[PDB]
From a paper:
The ribonuclease in these processes is the RNA exosome complex, which degrades transcripts in a 3′–5′ direction and in a processive manner. The helicase can extract [name] from the ribosome and is expected to transfer it to the exoribonuclease core through a bridging factor, HBS1L3 (also known as SKI7), but the mechanisms of this molecular handover remain unclear. We show that rather than a sequential handover, a direct physical coupling mechanism takes place, which culminates in the formation of a cytoplasmic exosome–ribosome supercomplex. Exosome and ribosome thus work together as a single structural and functional unit in co-translational [name] decay, coordinating their activities in a transient supercomplex.
When analysing the cryo-EM data and, in particular, a subset of 40S-containing particles, we recognized the characteristic shape of the SKI2N38 gatekeeping module in a density feature on the side of the 40S subunit. Processing of the 40S-containing subset allowed us to obtain a reconstruction showing that the ribosomal subunit binds to the helicase–ribonuclease exosome assembly through the SKI2H module ( for the 80S-bound reconstruction) and to the SKI2N38 gatekeeping module. Fitting the structure of SKI2N38 in the density revealed that the C-terminal repeats of human [name] (TPRs 39–40) interact with the ‘head’ of the 40S subunit, in particular contacting the 18S rRNA (at helix 39 in expansion segment 9) and ribosomal protein eS19. Notably, this region of [name] is a hotspot for mutations associated with a congenital disease known as trichohepatoenteric syndrome (THES). When we superposed our reconstruction with that of a collided disome, we noticed that in a configuration in which the helicase and gatekeeping modules of [name] would bind to the stalled (leading) ribosome, the SKI8OUT subunit would inherently be positioned to interact with the trailing ribosome. In the active ‘open’ state of the helicase complex, the regulatory SKI2N38 gatekeeping module not only recruits the cytoplasmic exosome by binding to SKI7, but also engages the ribosome 40S subunit. The structural and biochemical analyses furthermore suggest that the SKI2N38 gatekeeping module can bind collided disomes.
Residue numbers in the entry:
A (entry chain C), B (entry chain D): 1 to 305
C (entry chain B): 631 to 1564
D (entry chain A): 1 to 122, 157 to 197
Write the structure that this text describes.
Amino acid sequence: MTNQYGILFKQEQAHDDAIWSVAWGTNKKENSETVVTGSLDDLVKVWKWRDERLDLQWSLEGHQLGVVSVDISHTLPIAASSSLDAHIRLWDLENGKQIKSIDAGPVDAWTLAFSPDSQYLATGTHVGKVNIFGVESGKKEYSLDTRGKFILSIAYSPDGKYLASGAIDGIINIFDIATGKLLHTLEGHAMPIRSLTFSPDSQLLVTASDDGYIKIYDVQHANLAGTLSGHASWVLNVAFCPDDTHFVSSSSDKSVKVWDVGTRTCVHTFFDHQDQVWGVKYNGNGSKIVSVGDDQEIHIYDCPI
Amino acid sequence: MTNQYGILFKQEQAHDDAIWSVAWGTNKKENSETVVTGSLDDLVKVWKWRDERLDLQWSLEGHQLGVVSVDISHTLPIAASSSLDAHIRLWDLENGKQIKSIDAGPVDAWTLAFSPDSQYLATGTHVGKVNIFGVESGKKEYSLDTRGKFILSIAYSPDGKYLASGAIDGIINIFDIATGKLLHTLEGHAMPIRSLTFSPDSQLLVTASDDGYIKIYDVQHANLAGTLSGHASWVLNVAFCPDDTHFVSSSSDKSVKVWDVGTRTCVHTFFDHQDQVWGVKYNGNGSKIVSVGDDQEIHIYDCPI
Amino acid sequence: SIYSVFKVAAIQQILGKYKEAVAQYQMIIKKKEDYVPALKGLGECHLMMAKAALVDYLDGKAVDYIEKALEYFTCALQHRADVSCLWKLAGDACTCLYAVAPSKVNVHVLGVLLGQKEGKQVLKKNELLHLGGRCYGRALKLMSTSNTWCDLGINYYRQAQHLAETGSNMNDLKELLEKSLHCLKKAVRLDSNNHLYWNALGVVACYSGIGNYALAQHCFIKSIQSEQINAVAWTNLGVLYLTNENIEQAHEAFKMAQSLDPSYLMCWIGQALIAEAVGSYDTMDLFRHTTELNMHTEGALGYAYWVCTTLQDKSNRETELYQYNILQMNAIPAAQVILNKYVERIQNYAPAFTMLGYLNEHLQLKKEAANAYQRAILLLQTAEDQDTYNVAIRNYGRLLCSTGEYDKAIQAFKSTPLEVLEDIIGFALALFMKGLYKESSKAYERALSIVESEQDKAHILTALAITEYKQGKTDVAKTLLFKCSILKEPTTESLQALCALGLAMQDATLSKAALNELLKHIKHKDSNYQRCLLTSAIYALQGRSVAVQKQISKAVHSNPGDPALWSLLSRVVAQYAQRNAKGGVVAGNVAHILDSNHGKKALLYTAVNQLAMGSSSAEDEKNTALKTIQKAALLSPGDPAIWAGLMAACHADDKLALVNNTQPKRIDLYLALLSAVSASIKDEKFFENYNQSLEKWSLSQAVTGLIDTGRISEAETLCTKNLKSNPDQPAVILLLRQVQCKPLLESQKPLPDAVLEELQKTVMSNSTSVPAWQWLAHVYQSQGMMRAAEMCYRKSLQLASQRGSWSGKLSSLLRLALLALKVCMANISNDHWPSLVQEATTEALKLCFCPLAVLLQALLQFKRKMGARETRRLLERVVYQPGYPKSIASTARWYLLRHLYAKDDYELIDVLVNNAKTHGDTRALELNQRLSSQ
Amino acid sequence: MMETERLVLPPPDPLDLPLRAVELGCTGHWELLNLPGAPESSLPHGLPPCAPDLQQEAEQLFLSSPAWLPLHGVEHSARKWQRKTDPWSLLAVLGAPVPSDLQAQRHPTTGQILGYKEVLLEGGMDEPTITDLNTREEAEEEIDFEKDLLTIPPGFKKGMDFA
């Protein structure tokens, strides 16, 4: 019953150090398939999967410390990255030379996330707020406030009007873009979350925590649909499939597992990635899976519909 | 029936802290009687028993943390030592000045054991493998791999072609040097072993465990010949006599006992060593017994043939 | 044409994908707003999605879907009011929301339905059921069919059930029951060949208010006969037999029904009920399978009760039933989710709330536990209140006190009769937590008077000593702990408290006795970390500072596992005896390897050890202090020490890049890191002295880095703001002086003796710090005062030697040697500076093996002489013996080549030239060629 | 101390180069730069504070409060609950399917849709007082449910009997 799964591509050494983030973006209407990775360095190398392999195209740089998170937009060709250098400089992604550069410390911005219309590029700060900047318009026009500890994750629904945020100690806050008032706060876990993502036609919110558990919550209320516990170590990143039937999770036990929401079970497990895996993402259509690990290797998988 | 036993020599304070390992080597054909000890320091002091006493000859040092294991060769004059410093530096033992220095952490090497021809110097790691280096030739040419926990004991048969290894939780693995393939695994105990030794014309394997029991196994099969339980505390080191008639075991209850393999009973017990004893060894011929304890004292005994 | 697109959308609806069909129907309704079939399709789709949502436990989604379906249904009924399809669907929609959380269902129904057309109105559950009955009656009037008769009967049954459930009335529902019975009999008599009608008749007959079991059995048998594969009727008969003490035949009927349908939940629940009633061994497994299948309330409650009972019993810990059941299946989280759904559905069971609270408490979910206890309190005030309510009060108070909110916890423990040990002890703990130690002490003696279960008494004595000590007055607490020790069997907590109390004073002998007592006869404790920490603190208190490493190495050797011990070793070598920096780095790396959740502290400690070491490696990347501190920062960006280490690593990397002379990098981030340090410091409970030291070090290092990089204005503004915030402290005034004196004196300029005197007075203001003395000696040297700089260096040396420091002594020695050698190089008379050089270098060589000191000796000797062969021998020894830094070897090579060119030996000059060529150098070869062409 | 300034010659000499030293780390490791200037010492102020000392740590581990004692633990309460079961919630009822599909009509010849009429499958619209009274109006089979009732279930030898 379990479908046939195959890698079809393994990269020997993409970078020189641990890879911390990866983003796959099918931004343009034709087959672009742009992949941007950042790995404990100034290097924000951009790869391209042309037919069956990855070919390096850009080696744009200009950072001073290790980049911790990268993200890519689906409407316009653009990219953004942040590091411990306290600088959010967004690249052009076609010629790749430093369109802008925003000053914001670890007390002002931690992770990156583009708006569904690629207009705001919200970030999270130490004091618990969620700083929202403006692309091409200005810096720090306003920020939604919640009363909590260090905030790590910022997630956007694929239709807007929602904004989730995970924080240290497990407290989860949900805001509405239309008004900006705190709707309801979810207690969540007792350990840091460090991973959130919505789904299309959003009605499900999936949380990954530091204790190994995976909670399945329901938006617009506080009802949880279940708890998935299959991993043995910390869970670091979770990405959802383009159709609401599966989602992939990567843990700290050197194992990448894919679950199914309909039956709440693990359909397959991949035994690769000899070291920790720090990022997994889907492509435009749910056929391939990318995964970058603490060890210097980039893995692409194949998941049939 | 029990023979006359006497100490004939007691050292007041050989070192300043607890002694963790001892090696007795009759390397040269004439009366050398070299004794090397390491004791919770940088000091790897080498003593010599000339006629009736021990005389200090070398006080070579150069370690940063406590030395946990020492060994001496019987063919060539040479010595080796390892510590928590993550350095296996082998000494000349004639002039005693740092012939070599190999980099290997506690995750790469824990204990030392010379080859019967003094050529391989196998060690044990946390991940379960058995790293084998090369004296005078190179570093880390190959390592036998087993899927287990921290490994503690490494033993060589006096004719080669065999390699035993005790580990935490009691799992015992036996390898053959000629090929390097796992022959058979013995369940043993459920707690760490921390002591192993073969016998001449090797056909008997004696194991010491943490629960006070002493198992006597037979190589080339999985048949156990019996279980000896006479001690009251942890058993730390076991050394076998040059003739297959006796073997000496040292426990944590401040008692040194000598057993006999033929009838599996304790012929005599020595009530000395007010604190724990961490090492016992035999000399070239089975006439004297050395024992080092947690208290700073060196004891030499006398066992008639 | 629109009919084709509508039929396409209808087909799309049949083959699932209901959302697309709803969107298509909306698109069709866009062009034409009065098409009836599209409204009917939307209503049917909304009803089915609502029922699917009700299959799971989503009451808000279901209520919203019913409201939308009702709006669409009345919109369609506006246009065509003679169609039995719309009337029956409206009745179905109204009666569908049955047995769903009363007082949570409030639906907006608009317009004609509620008599006269008036805006929008809000109806309750009973009113909604009455409207459904009316709609069913209208459908029956327009079309008389047995199906609608049965639907009306089921609606009346639901109305009667709702009226009975809430306890609103009794014996006044007989008319409704008679109507339902008549409708169902009429329906079954219109067509007596439908198992559905027969089963419905049986179900309505067997209601507790009627209890006509003979007719129920007849109807169930008839339904079975009408159609053979009837699992529902079979399991209904099995349930009837089971409740009327018929275990055997109920088991037979449930087994047959299970065989006829393997995926039916009620038959499985019945099997579980019989197994529980007989006391079998697989009841828990049956309940778990039932809960996994379809999340029903009965299986939920059974599984919850069994798990709670198994957890409550404390003698099962190794029986292999508790182990497998509660660890291999991960029972606790599944039970927790099950209880949230059950309490959402029912929400009037205080025991269920208490079980949910107990599981959440066990799972460290204290806020949810407090909420559950609050709901149980609200439900339980109007109860018998003997055991349920007082226990609820105590548990609510304990949980509330645990999550702060101390005043409310005190009030909650006030609102209960204080005659039981649990309530008094919880009140005492909350009282102590807020403060107000005297009433807490009275309550604790009261608990001691009541106490039994002597271990508890010993713990009460320990608590009394702790709270009494918080009030000072240590002698009586010491006597109390001694009294606890004299008792027949001491407890580990009491001995640990006694040892820590002895540690608080500087006595150090009572602590040794208590530690000996703990070591003598206590072995069941399975925490090596606490004992090792206590022993290390014992040794460190007497100021030895060396036996700590020996004790921790012994502990690590005894237990090679326990990564906590490795982390402690790394931390201790970071703090005490920081000469085994390589060993500390190794211990940190090993501690990080052995596990994952210790990586933060392990990486911090190995980063600090690497920083202390410097650059004593093979110049390999990916293994420097910067990389490890970045990894630690990623793992846990919450502590201030990581940011401080980041500052130190950035400064060290700046110095290394200057030394290698390639590029400065990571220039200006000190302000952001300082702000992060302050923000992360502000959120810790109490480390007052440690926090003050951390902030002082961070601020001073940031100011120094800004001064070094060249942002003099920002540093001055920061210093002025700091001095304005609070009254003056000498360290900040010295820091401001250093900031101010950067513009003046980089380039040669004389300064008044007045400025020197205030600076000297300020340096005197904050004494016992070697850096300030060394800096003032450097300032004196820069203006030029050889004697003053030498006296200041001697003062710093004596200060460092007295305080037990070692790096400061070496630095003072080397600086004094450099100064004296510099003044000697000016070829001045009064040749006492060479004597100073010789004494300083001899002392440095006695301290350790210093290549810089031997090079200074060689340079002075070279200044003195040149004819003597020995000078050449010494220089060749320095330049040729291995294990030397590149710069010192280069300087020795340079001076040797100079001396030999003066001595005119071309073979030796060629030897030096080729030796320089084997390594990497340019300056020596350049000067070699330059003097070759004289 | 005299406080006599001592002027040193301004040019070092080209033939000889200045002596600029740099200190690396706490554990002694020096070197020599070519370029005359600051002593340029790394971590001037010492190592940073790191973790607190062991005495404070042990003071904090125990003498913070009595909340770490096992008398305020998850155990030591001896709770217990009382089991209630409810077989009757295992009854199930199904709903009859809709009796009409509302199928379209067609003009005979040149098929076109005139309207929609309700086909069977195989005044004052406010629903006032719509209840049904004066029952027992038609004859369907005249079945009797009150006199002769089944007792024997199918497949089963005898049946449980109620008075």
